Amino acid sequence: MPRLICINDYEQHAKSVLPKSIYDYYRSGANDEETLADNIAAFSRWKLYPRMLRNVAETDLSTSVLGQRVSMPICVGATAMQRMAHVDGELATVRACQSLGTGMMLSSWATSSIEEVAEAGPEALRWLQLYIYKDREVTKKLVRQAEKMGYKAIFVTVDTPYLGNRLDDVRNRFKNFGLAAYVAKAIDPSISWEDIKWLRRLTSLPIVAKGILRGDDAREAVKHGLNGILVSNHGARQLDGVPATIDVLPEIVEAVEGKVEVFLDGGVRKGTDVLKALALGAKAVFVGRPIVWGLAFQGEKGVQDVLEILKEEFRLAMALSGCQNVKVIDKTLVRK
Amino acid sequence: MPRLICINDYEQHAKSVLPKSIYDYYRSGANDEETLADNIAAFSRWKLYPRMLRNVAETDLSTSVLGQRVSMPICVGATAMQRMAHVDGELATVRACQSLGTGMMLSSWATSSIEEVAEAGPEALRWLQLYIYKDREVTKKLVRQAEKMGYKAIFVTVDTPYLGNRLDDVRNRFKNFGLAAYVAKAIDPSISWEDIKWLRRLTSLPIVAKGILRGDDAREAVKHGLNGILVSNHGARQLDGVPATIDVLPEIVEAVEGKVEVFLDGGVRKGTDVLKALALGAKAVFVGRPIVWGLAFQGEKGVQDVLEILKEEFRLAMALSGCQNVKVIDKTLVRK
Amino acid sequence: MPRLICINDYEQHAKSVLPKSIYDYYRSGANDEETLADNIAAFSRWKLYPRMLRNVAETDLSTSVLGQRVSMPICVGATAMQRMAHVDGELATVRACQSLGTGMMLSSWATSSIEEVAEAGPEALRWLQLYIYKDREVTKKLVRQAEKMGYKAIFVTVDTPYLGNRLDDVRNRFKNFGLAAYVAKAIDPSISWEDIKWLRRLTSLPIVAKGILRGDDAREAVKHGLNGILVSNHGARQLDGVPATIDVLPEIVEAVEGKVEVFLDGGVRKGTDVLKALALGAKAVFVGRPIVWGLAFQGEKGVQDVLEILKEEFRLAMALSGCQNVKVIDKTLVRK
Amino acid sequence: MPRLICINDYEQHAKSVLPKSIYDYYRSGANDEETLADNIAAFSRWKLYPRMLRNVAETDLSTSVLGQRVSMPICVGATAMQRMAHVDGELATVRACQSLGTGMMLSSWATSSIEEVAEAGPEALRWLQLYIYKDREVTKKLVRQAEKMGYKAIFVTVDTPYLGNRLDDVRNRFKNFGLAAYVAKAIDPSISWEDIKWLRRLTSLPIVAKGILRGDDAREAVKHGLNGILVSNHGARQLDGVPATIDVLPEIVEAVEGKVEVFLDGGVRKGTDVLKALALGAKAVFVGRPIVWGLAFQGEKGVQDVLEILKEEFRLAMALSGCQNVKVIDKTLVRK
Numbered sequence A, B, C, D: 001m002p003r004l005i006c007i008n009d010y011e012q013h014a015k016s017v018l019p020k021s022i023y024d025y026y027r028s029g030a031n032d033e034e035t036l037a038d039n040i041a042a043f044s045r046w047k048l049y050p051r052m053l054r055n056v057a058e059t060d061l062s063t064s065v066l067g068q069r070v071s072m073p074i075c076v077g078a079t080a081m082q083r084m085a086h087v088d089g090e091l092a093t094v095r096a097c098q099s100l101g102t103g104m105m106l107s108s109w110a111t112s113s114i115e116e117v118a119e120a121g122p123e124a125l126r127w128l129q130l131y132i133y134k135d136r137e138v139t140k141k142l143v144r145q146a147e148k149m150g151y152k153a154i155f156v157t158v159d160t161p162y163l164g165n166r167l168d169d170v171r172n173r174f175k176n177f178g179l180a181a182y183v184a185k186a187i188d189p190s191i192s193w194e195d196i197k198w199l200r201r202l203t204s205l206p207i208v209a210k211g212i213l214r215g216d217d218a219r220e221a222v223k224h225g226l227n228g229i230l231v232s233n234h235g236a237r238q239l240d241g242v243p244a245t246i247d248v249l250p251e252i253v254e255a256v257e258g259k260v261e262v263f264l265d266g267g268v269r270k271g272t273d274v275l276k277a278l279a280l281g282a283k284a285v286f287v288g289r290p291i292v293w294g295l296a297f298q299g300e301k302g303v304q305d306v307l308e309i310l311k312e313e314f315r316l317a318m319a320l321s322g323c324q325n326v327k328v329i330d331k332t333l334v335r336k
């Protein structure tokens, strides 16, 4: 059990208990961290226009992601090597997701195997985040493992031909196959739409393009037969000076013309952030850093607590805005 | 008698004399308090365009609220359990309103009975703020008591299906029928326009919808036969990230097409704030926190002093803007 | 002779040598001082678009105010009771204006008589600032004295039916006929366009309306046969929350359609401020507080130094913007 | 070899090792330094819209400046008297440019002769920055020396009829022919388009107009047969309150209608700044202060390190934005 009542409290506690180099690795954005600040600031510029007297006695937060039911439109995003935050790492995370009835996106650079996570969370909704590695044999092996171990989708990260320049990591230096050296050597900078065609042919699993920021790229992902877009700037860790994901979301929703689900990550810290993303047409949002702060506090119980805080904040935001369920969250609730 | 010459001085004095938990309860907004800051910041963005050489020798501040004459378009808003600020609580407040010739809105969660307040301020203009409680029998009893004890209107609060998440109250924990537990258990989250129809049938008293932020909700309140709209975000204590009330006011005034009076609360601290609200079409404004700071300073004399400061600031703002009376305050005085 | 090289240096020195109550009286704006900050901030939002390769070898700063030649479009504005800043007060100021070849506007609430100032600066361009006092006999006497003693215009202040609420003056409490009490008792709040008609009939001297912020009021001043508009918010000391004078200037210039000269005061501290005001169509600007800071430093020599700093800054701003004289300063030099 | 990993680190190190008066001379902008702050802030307002899945395995940074190949669109701008920063001054700078395969613009107020710099960097791409001095004989001699010693262009500075007012230089006081006195006496304030005609007739070398901020001036430079425009506010050291160069660039690119190359300097500190300038139509950018900070750290090795940091940041920005070469950097990558 100190008393942590919002996501910011979990971050402040994590700073107090993590070694500075580990806290800095988790916290940091690219270069001058303009986008890191904007992912949060942009949510505040979108104002809520709540409806009164709707009857919100029995708020229902449940929705579906790529045809699978979830308890809430708030899911765990991929964050590499969770065992740095807590000894149980990804196993703690999947156990919390199982408890909450939400989905976990497992990093393909995890400190737990695809099989181990599936064995720890057999009833959990689980997706695999994938890089198309220079080694296409190990890429293929991960997708086959995901299929065999009951994972329900592939999130292919498309914004990382190279790793971003996070200054604190350079100052501090530095389980399915840790230093930026070895990761940089593994990731293929040549990845093209031809490689998306190869991945689409490799699996019948739903594939989501993670890291799209342009309407024209979203349209190309639909044309390649992908099943969703995760509007993401990689938590502002790749190219600094890109827009906030909440500011780009409306463009992407407009561009895909309802053909695939659109998701958002980047800067989600509060229930009102979730409400604004759904009002602008996202099906669900993903959280990265909040999950790591949960792990740092108390492993599985810490992740469960973070997810329960976001769930309760989202329920209250829905109720106060006059929304009894996610289907009645509409564009007129928000204006910038 | 320290020397307090503006409303901010009263707040700073209240911080110095109140226990931190009580000051924090009064001061706080919801969650990250974005709207709390914006209720004040938004007034500064509206600029005044004063007329010169009008003859403002005999400035007349008097107006009417729902057909009842008042000395100034500045009235006391509902604030629960005033006896926390001063031993005399609501009785101090109503005695000050009687002295000033303005109206008092009594919280239905007051530390003085409807009868006690009416006995302390028999000549005061008095209104009852109402929640539609899960217990409709006690709701009915309050309205009947208001009628019998010479209250002139019902302000039905419509923005509180649940209580907002004020973080300091969670950190500090915690007379007509005190802990958020007991209040949360009393308030009905199922309240709908059907319950407004029931209230409209229950009383011939004028009814004002308190907490409307959307033009479409304002139009529905007119269609239900209500007699006014109080444009309010509950002092930024309910849903955080809603607009400032002064920014929403023009939309609501436009939407009701002169069919009912429109009032404002939220962030009123200065005479120029009152002038801007009337220029944008509000009939009168309500003050919440300033009254509590008055009580904390010196009970009845403190409330009288706060109200006299706002009156004098408003008279000077009117005179310097070329307005001899409230009927000549027009839209051309302000631009954002 | 410390080394003061810009107007801000003179203010910082004045703070160091004046009693706090006197510094605060000079520095202060009305209420929360929003307009005080904006008079300066607004100049920074107007950006300069300099022309290159014009030939600025022999920059000529000279212009005319109401038909009288001046060395530069930078004149001394009225500031009451200059003897608080320096023993020589208004006599020091007029001697500096005589040296510079610019005009002095004498406050009608001066610590030197109209005759004394005329005797100290017989060759100086001198104007009288006038309030229409409740006592019209003493108002008439001031205008007749101005005429007899070789003053070239009347600036009638029209934004002061009452004195503004400057909070520091209230905290600190407190020669042609000192406490706000006595000044408040002297100034007529009934002044109307009828009183402007009376003043226009009283003198053939040029009359400038000082304190106009609306185009419609500027047009009425032209219709009443006045000879100029001084766009002024009284150094942000009257109604707080009015716009910056530089932001209102274009509206007023447009409204008078070239029929009378338009002047500006409020926030002029730098040569680029003068250039921006002339680019937006002002004939000349007036400085209030900078002159008091000059007096506080070294009386006549201090005022001369402040005026010489503004002159040199303005010459450099003209030269770097490609303007050899004031007639070639045009609207295309600035954009907001 | 402290560990400096970005340009800001080099500045902070230079502040620690340079005498305050020298650091202040290098750092300072004109007057209140509004433009100094805006040259940097303006880059942050331009947001990047990266393309994904392009194949950026073999990023090629090479381009051409005025027909000469360079390794990257990042060149060294003219900064007077580099020997104040390091004993080797301009010879250190040209040796670093030779190593990098980029161009050096040599100040005509250098602490090394045109011949000495050419002898130190015989293989380096070298340009001469020129003032048209009151002494046209020495102006002619510099151009003839540039021609003879294998310099490939003249950058004629057109924004300096007089030197800007940098306040710190006034507080601190103070090799082809040091005090502002002697420089002020040398520079001709009469320079006109007639003098540009004279310079165009004097040399067949390409001539770039350095310091243009207006589209109409850019068009006149094209009409006079000049070969490029360097959009520059002289590192915010001349007229304060001009726009940021990145904000003026689109106007200038539009105005010249592809007739000549357009370059930018002012506020370039990061690879994303270079990318934004090229996306808005600049051929290349110049850096001033970063080179001086390199010299202050470790002479030639320090300049090489600064240039290598900008090169690597630019390569990563190109790769993450989906640009394999400079020819595919287009207007759709940026929005303000």
Ligand SMILES: Cc1cc2nc3c(=O)[nH]c(=O)nc-3n(C[C@H](O)[C@H](O)[C@H](O)COP(=O)(O)O)c2cc1C
Pocket: A025, A026, A027, A039, A077, A078, A079, A080, A107, A108, A109, A129, A157, A210, A232, A233, A234, A235, A236, A237, A265, A266, A267, A268, A286, A287, A288, A289, A290
């Ligand atoms: C420490 C850390 C590790 C991450 N690792 C990965 C990863 O392995 N794969 C991936 O696609 N994204 C990764 N991301 C990006 C996240 O999936 C996600 O886009 C981001 O955290 C969302 O922003 P938020 O942290 O503001 O919630 C990582 C982010 C962080 C902070």
Ligand SMILES: Cc1cc2nc3c(=O)[nH]c(=O)nc-3n(C[C@H](O)[C@H](O)[C@H](O)COP(=O)(O)O)c2cc1C
Pocket: B025, B026, B027, B039, B077, B078, B079, B080, B107, B108, B109, B129, B157, B210, B232, B233, B234, B235, B236, B237, B265, B266, B267, B268, B286, B287, B288, B289, B290
């Ligand atoms: C301490 C406190 C108690 C309040 N209690 C009530 C209440 O019982 N009923 C109600 O309708 N509104 C209540 N409000 C909201 C106020 O009526 C009013 O909308 C708000 O205070 C106006 O904003 P201001 O405080 O900035 O003037 C309360 C506000 C505060 C700060």
Ligand SMILES: Cc1cc2nc3c(=O)[nH]c(=O)nc-3n(C[C@H](O)[C@H](O)[C@H](O)COP(=O)(O)O)c2cc1C
Pocket: C025, C026, C027, C039, C077, C078, C079, C080, C107, C108, C109, C129, C157, C210, C232, C233, C234, C235, C236, C237, C265, C266, C267, C268, C286, C287, C288, C289, C290
């Ligand atoms: C201390 C002080 C005294 C003033 N006295 C007068 C006055 O007697 N009459 C008047 O018309 N304006 C008066 N003003 C307003 C000034 O004439 C002028 O509008 C203002 O100072 C311009 O702004 P600035 O101080 O930013 O230059 C006064 C201003 C100050 C600061």
Ligand SMILES: Cc1cc2nc3c(=O)[nH]c(=O)nc-3n(C[C@H](O)[C@H](O)[C@H](O)COP(=O)(O)O)c2cc1C
Pocket: D025, D026, D027, D039, D077, D078, D079, D080, D107, D108, D109, D129, D157, D210, D232, D233, D234, D235, D236, D237, D265, D266, D267, D268, D286, D287, D288, D289, D290
């Ligand atoms: C210390 C210093 C000396 C300079 N000397 C010259 C010069 O001799 N000639 C010239 O044309 N520009 C000169 N400049 C302006 C630069 O060429 C260039 O426009 C400016 O430094 C670009 O901005 P940045 O410093 O933000 O990169 C100088 C700038 C600085 C900071």
Ligand SMILES: CN(C)c1noc(-c2cccc(CNc3ccc4n[nH]c(C(=O)O)c4c3)c2O)n1
Pocket: A021, A022, A025, A080, A081, A084, A109, A163, A169, A172, A173, A174, A178, A179, A180, A181, A183, A234, A237
């Ligand atoms: C003091 N620490 C822990 C430290 N300093 O630098 C590093 C570090 C540097 C590079 C890579 C890793 C871990 N592996 C991966 C693998 C794939 C990824 N995709 N996105 C990210 C991301 O961090 O945004 C990824 C990280 C690191 O842990 N760690």
Ligand SMILES: CN(C)c1noc(-c2cccc(CNc3ccc4n[nH]c(C(=O)O)c4c3)c2O)n1
Pocket: B021, B022, B025, B080, B081, B084, B109, B163, B169, B172, B173, B174, B178, B179, B180, B181, B183, B234, B237
């Ligand atoms: C340390 N104190 C005094 C503390 N901490 O938490 C609480 C508290 C929490 C919940 C409720 C109350 C009081 N009752 C009500 C009743 C109706 C209301 N309508 N609006 C409000 C509001 O506060 O905005 C209302 C408050 C409280 O006093 N008090």
Ligand SMILES: CN(C)c1noc(-c2cccc(CNc3ccc4n[nH]c(C(=O)O)c4c3)c2O)n1
Pocket: C021, C022, C025, C080, C081, C084, C109, C163, C169, C172, C173, C174, C178, C179, C180, C181, C183, C234, C237
């Ligand atoms: C500690 N001091 C010096 C102090 N505190 O309060 C006061 C004071 C208060 C009221 C009036 C005066 C002086 N008389 C006038 C007369 C006409 C004016 N027109 N504009 C102004 C202005 O100040 O903006 C005027 C001031 C004061 O000096 N002085």
Ligand SMILES: CN(C)c1noc(-c2cccc(CNc3ccc4n[nH]c(C(=O)O)c4c3)c2O)n1
Pocket: D021, D022, D025, D080, D081, D084, D109, D163, D169, D172, D173, D174, D178, D179, D180, D181, D183, D234, D237
């Ligand atoms: C403590 N130092 C070094 C100091 N204080 O003032 C000065 C100084 C003042 C004036 C001139 C110089 C050097 N000569 C030149 C020559 C041509 C130039 N073109 N642009 C600039 C610029 O600085 O922006 C130029 C500077 C100075 O070094 N130096």
